[PDB]
Amino acid sequence: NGLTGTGVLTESNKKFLPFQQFGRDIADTTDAVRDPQTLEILDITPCSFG
Amino acid sequence: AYYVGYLQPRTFLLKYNENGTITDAVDCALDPLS
């Protein structure tokens, strides 16, 4: 719903507050989201590179 | 009994819990320590 990105999506085990959509890291990069339809938190890890 | 404050443009330092809630803060224009 607006957040555009790339990466691997994975089942999370963090708990947002029930009005927060996505989570950010220190240095300010999106690293978790909440799925609008099912309302579950998913981590966003980058794509294997090197 | 009721109160009315007003809001100004300030800069704060918010401390976030591990669940993601704000538990403490610092107003950075109060005094030299802040």
């Binding site: 947002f16 927060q20 959509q21 996505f22 | 404050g5 809001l7 704060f12 330092l13 918010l14 993601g20």
Partner: peptide, 24 residues
């Protein structure tokens, strides 16, 4: 009358989760 707030009127500036991070 007038009174003194102490530490009152702090709101979450927006969505986006977050944990232990003295964010400015």
């Amino acid at each position: 009358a007038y009174t003194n707030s102490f530490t009152r009127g702090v709101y979450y500036p927006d969505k986006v989760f977050r944990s232990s991070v003295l964010h400015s």
